Write an enzyme that holds these catalytic residues in place. Structure first.
Site, PDB file in Angstrom:
ATOM      1  N   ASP B  32       0.805  -1.183  -0.093  1.00  0.00           N
ATOM      2  CA  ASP B  32       0.111   0.098   0.033  1.00  0.00           C
ATOM      3  C   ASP B  32       1.074   1.470  -0.118  1.00  0.00           C
ATOM      4  OD1 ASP B  32      -1.969   2.193   1.225  1.00  0.00           O
ATOM      5  OD2 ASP B  32      -2.998   0.506   0.639  1.00  0.00           O
ATOM      6  N   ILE B  33       0.606   2.339  -0.547  1.00  0.00           N
ATOM      7  CA  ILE B  33       1.454   3.776  -0.813  1.00  0.00           C
ATOM      8  C   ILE B  33       0.943   4.509   0.509  1.00  0.00           C
ATOM      9  CG2 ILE B  33       1.480   3.066  -3.120  1.00  0.00           C
ATOM     10  CD1 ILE B  33      -0.205   5.585  -3.564  1.00  0.00           C
ATOM     11  N   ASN B  88     -12.889  -3.659   2.647  1.00  0.00           N
ATOM     12  CA  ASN B  88     -13.794  -2.640   2.986  1.00  0.00           C
ATOM     13  C   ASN B  88     -14.621  -2.423   1.609  1.00  0.00           C
ATOM     14  OD1 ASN B  88     -12.134  -1.322   4.981  1.00  0.00           O
ATOM     15  ND2 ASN B  88     -11.387   0.178   3.428  1.00  0.00           N
ATOM     16  N   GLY B  94     -15.375   2.872   3.340  1.00  0.00           N
ATOM     17  CA  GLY B  94     -14.386   3.949   3.489  1.00  0.00           C
ATOM     18  C   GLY B  94     -13.264   3.259   2.110  1.00  0.00           C
ATOM     19  N   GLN B  95     -14.377   2.473   1.839  1.00  0.00           N
ATOM     20  CA  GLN B  95     -13.437   2.150   0.063  1.00  0.00           C
ATOM     21  C   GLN B  95     -13.995   3.531  -0.944  1.00  0.00           C
ATOM     22  OE1 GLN B  95     -16.326  -1.148  -2.658  1.00  0.00           O
ATOM     23  NE2 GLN B  95     -14.369  -1.517  -3.928  1.00  0.00           N
ATOM     24  N   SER B  96     -12.928   3.144  -1.792  1.00  0.00           N
ATOM     25  CA  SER B  96     -12.740   4.443  -2.324  1.00  0.00           C
ATOM     26  C   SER B  96     -12.021   3.614  -4.004  1.00  0.00           C
ATOM     27  CB  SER B  96     -11.603   5.655  -2.183  1.00  0.00           C
ATOM     28  OG  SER B  96     -12.896   6.206  -1.278  1.00  0.00           O
ATOM     29  N   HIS B 101     -10.499  -5.753  -2.246  1.00  0.00           N
ATOM     30  CA  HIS B 101      -8.558  -5.670  -2.523  1.00  0.00           C
ATOM     31  C   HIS B 101      -9.201  -6.125  -0.824  1.00  0.00           C
ATOM     32  CE1 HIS B 101     -10.581  -0.775  -2.540  1.00  0.00           C
ATOM     33  NE2 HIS B 101      -9.646  -1.260  -0.947  1.00  0.00           N
ATOM     34  N   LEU B 102      -8.521  -6.925  -0.427  1.00  0.00           N
ATOM     35  CA  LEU B 102      -7.826  -7.494   0.650  1.00  0.00           C
ATOM     36  C   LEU B 102      -6.961  -7.020   1.180  1.00  0.00           C
ATOM     37  CD1 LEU B 102      -9.267  -9.612   3.178  1.00  0.00           C
ATOM     38  CD2 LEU B 102      -7.065 -11.176   2.091  1.00  0.00           C
TER      39      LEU B 102
HETATM   40  N1  LIG Z   1      -1.115   2.954  -6.950  1.00  0.00           N
HETATM   41  C1  LIG Z   1      -1.649   2.546  -5.346  1.00  0.00           C
HETATM   42  N2  LIG Z   1      -0.391   1.998  -4.463  1.00  0.00           N
HETATM   43  C2  LIG Z   1      -0.596   1.152  -3.701  1.00  0.00           C
HETATM   44  N3  LIG Z   1      -1.494   1.040  -3.079  1.00  0.00           N
HETATM   45  C3  LIG Z   1      -2.445   2.653  -3.408  1.00  0.00           C
HETATM   46  C4  LIG Z   1      -2.260   2.985  -5.003  1.00  0.00           C
HETATM   47  N4  LIG Z   1      -3.435   3.903  -4.887  1.00  0.00           N
HETATM   48  C5  LIG Z   1      -4.190   4.023  -3.449  1.00  0.00           C
HETATM   49  N5  LIG Z   1      -4.176   2.883  -2.965  1.00  0.00           N
HETATM   50  C6  LIG Z   1      -4.673   2.107  -1.234  1.00  0.00           C
HETATM   51  O1  LIG Z   1      -5.114   1.000  -1.466  1.00  0.00           O
HETATM   52  C7  LIG Z   1      -5.770   0.890  -0.722  1.00  0.00           C
HETATM   53  C8  LIG Z   1      -7.351   1.323  -1.226  1.00  0.00           C
HETATM   54  O2  LIG Z   1      -8.041   2.046  -1.864  1.00  0.00           O
HETATM   55  P1  LIG Z   1      -9.461   3.607  -1.392  1.00  0.00           P
HETATM   56  O3  LIG Z   1      -9.436   3.284   0.410  1.00  0.00           O
HETATM   57  O4  LIG Z   1     -10.425   2.318  -1.317  1.00  0.00           O
HETATM   58  O5  LIG Z   1      -9.235   4.684  -1.871  1.00  0.00           O
HETATM   59  P2  LIG Z   1      -7.799   5.391  -2.089  1.00  0.00           P
HETATM   60  O6  LIG Z   1      -6.594   4.758  -2.342  1.00  0.00           O
HETATM   61  O7  LIG Z   1      -7.782   6.194  -0.220  1.00  0.00           O
HETATM   62  O8  LIG Z   1      -8.759   6.737  -2.809  1.00  0.00           O
HETATM   63  P3  LIG Z   1      -9.646   8.180  -2.080  1.00  0.00           P
HETATM   64  O9  LIG Z   1     -10.188   9.022  -3.004  1.00  0.00           O
HETATM   65  O10 LIG Z   1     -10.311   7.748  -1.054  1.00  0.00           O
HETATM   66  O11 LIG Z   1      -8.231   9.448  -1.658  1.00  0.00           O
HETATM   67  P4  LIG Z   1      -8.550  10.854  -1.119  1.00  0.00           P
HETATM   68  O12 LIG Z   1      -8.167  10.496   0.244  1.00  0.00           O
HETATM   69  O13 LIG Z   1      -7.443  11.842  -0.954  1.00  0.00           O
HETATM   70  O14 LIG Z   1     -10.008  11.328  -0.779  1.00  0.00           O
HETATM   71  P5  LIG Z   1     -10.516  12.715  -1.578  1.00  0.00           P
HETATM   72  O15 LIG Z   1     -10.191  14.194  -1.453  1.00  0.00           O
HETATM   73  O16 LIG Z   1     -10.109  12.859  -3.212  1.00  0.00           O
HETATM   74  O17 LIG Z   1     -12.220  12.192  -1.799  1.00  0.00           O
HETATM   75  C9  LIG Z   1     -12.893  11.969  -1.480  1.00  0.00           C
HETATM   76  C10 LIG Z   1     -14.255  10.878  -2.467  1.00  0.00           C
HETATM   77  O18 LIG Z   1     -14.994  11.333  -2.310  1.00  0.00           O
HETATM   78  C11 LIG Z   1     -14.395  10.892  -4.260  1.00  0.00           C
HETATM   79  N6  LIG Z   1     -14.326  11.878  -5.408  1.00  0.00           N
HETATM   80  C12 LIG Z   1     -12.949  11.907  -5.829  1.00  0.00           C
HETATM   81  N7  LIG Z   1     -13.177  13.104  -7.362  1.00  0.00           N
HETATM   82  C13 LIG Z   1     -14.412  13.158  -7.057  1.00  0.00           C
HETATM   83  C14 LIG Z   1     -15.684  13.984  -7.707  1.00  0.00           C
HETATM   84  N8  LIG Z   1     -15.110  14.965  -9.141  1.00  0.00           N
HETATM   85  N9  LIG Z   1     -16.348  14.257  -7.104  1.00  0.00           N
HETATM   86  C15 LIG Z   1     -17.554  13.790  -6.009  1.00  0.00           C
HETATM   87  N10 LIG Z   1     -16.675  12.903  -5.242  1.00  0.00           N
HETATM   88  C16 LIG Z   1     -15.511  12.987  -5.600  1.00  0.00           C
HETATM   89  C17 LIG Z   1     -13.283   9.865  -3.811  1.00  0.00           C
HETATM   90  O19 LIG Z   1     -12.889   8.918  -4.567  1.00  0.00           O
HETATM   91  C18 LIG Z   1     -13.126  10.291  -2.944  1.00  0.00           C
HETATM   92  O20 LIG Z   1     -13.990   8.573  -2.591  1.00  0.00           O
HETATM   93  C19 LIG Z   1      -5.285   2.701  -0.405  1.00  0.00           C
HETATM   94  O21 LIG Z   1      -5.226   2.592   0.571  1.00  0.00           O
HETATM   95  C20 LIG Z   1      -4.951   2.875  -0.689  1.00  0.00           C
HETATM   96  O22 LIG Z   1      -3.655   3.744  -0.164  1.00  0.00           O
END
Ligand SMILES: Nc1ncnc2c1ncn2[C@@H]1O[C@H](COP(=O)(O)OP(=O)(O)OP(=O)(O)OP(=O)(O)OP(=O)(O)OC[C@H]2O[C@@H](n3cnc4c(N)ncnc43)[C@H](O)[C@@H]2O)[C@@H](O)[C@H]1O
EC number: 3.9.1.-
Lengths: 113, 115
Positions: B32-33, B88, B94-96, B101-102
């Site tokens: 995970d990054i 998740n 908390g899935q995004s 993914h596990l």
């Molecule tokens: N390359 C990689 N390599 C290894 N591990 C990796 C990886 N990339 C991710 N991972 C890891 O995989 C695991 C699962 O990931 P996961 O937890 O499922 O999602 P995430 O990677 O954290 O992506 P987020 O969108 O939640 O990032 P954020 O906190 O900045 O939220 P945001 O402010 O953008 O926005 C908040 C919410 O709004 C959503 N949103 C985004 N854009 C918009 C928009 N224009 N309009 C409305 N909603 C939006 C977002 O999707 C989000 O849900 C994590 O542990 C992760 O670290």
């Protein structure tokens, strides 16, 4: 099926609020819920912890997850949920009988403990 | 495309880099990054499944395989004192990234509740 409290629950020796049962697993509400919905899915086979699961039990483990999915939908968790398996002392494993916990009905937070 | 359109699909197809731990025909494990524990990795199916709530009954073996690979990778990474596996689902989970993914977290004491 084992000398833990979960073995006793499977054998119907002590009570639990059962949600689903089949020939190979049991799902029931957790006695110490950490969310508005918090249940466990456990195999009837006494696998003590995930670290010792055998390759042959791969589809049984997946079955726990599919049953967990189905129970979560039946219990109305349409906004999502978190599934958890704890291993060992660092994982906070509280009973040495493999269990998949499913929590929902509130926002789950990050980190997950 | 095999692996789907998310960033996890891109990782599967080697289009963006990742720190890979294990790979087979069914799944991929990588770090995970944004780690939340001293060791924190992901196990994903190569088949795109958006979220556990839409997994099919015939996906049982695959889902179990993610767990077996997770536990084997944890042992290979020296997580002898234990770890926590997390899936998740959706907004409350908390899935995004909508590719199932596990996550496996260890190397510290994990606390209760799990979020
Ligand atoms: N390359 C990689 N390599 C290894 N591990 C990796 C990886 N990339 C991710 N991972 C890891 O995989 C695991 C699962 O990931 P996961 O937890 O499922 O999602 P995430 O990677 O954290 O992506 P987020 O969108 O939640 O990032 P954020 O906190 O900045 O939220 P945001 O402010 O953008 O926005 C908040 C919410 O709004 C959503 N949103 C985004 N854009 C918009 C928009 N224009 N309009 C409305 N909603 C939006 C977002 O999707 C989000 O849900 C994590 O542990 C992760 O670290």
């Amino acid at each position: 099926g084992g000398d833990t409290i979960f073995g006793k629950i499977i054998r119907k020796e002590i009570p639990a609020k059962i949600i689903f049962e089949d020939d190979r697993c049991l799902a029931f509400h957790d006695i110490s819920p950490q969310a508005p919905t918090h249940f466990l899915v456990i195999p009837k086979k006494h696998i003590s912890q995930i670290s010792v699961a055998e390759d042959d039990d791969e589809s049984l483990l997946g079955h726990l997850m599919i049953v967990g999915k189905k129970c979560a939908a039946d219990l109305g968790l349409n906004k999502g949920y978190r599934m958890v398996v704890n291993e060992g002392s660092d994982g906070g494993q509280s009973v040495y009988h493999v269990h998949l916990a499913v929590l929902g009905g509130r926002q789950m937070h990050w980190p997950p403990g």
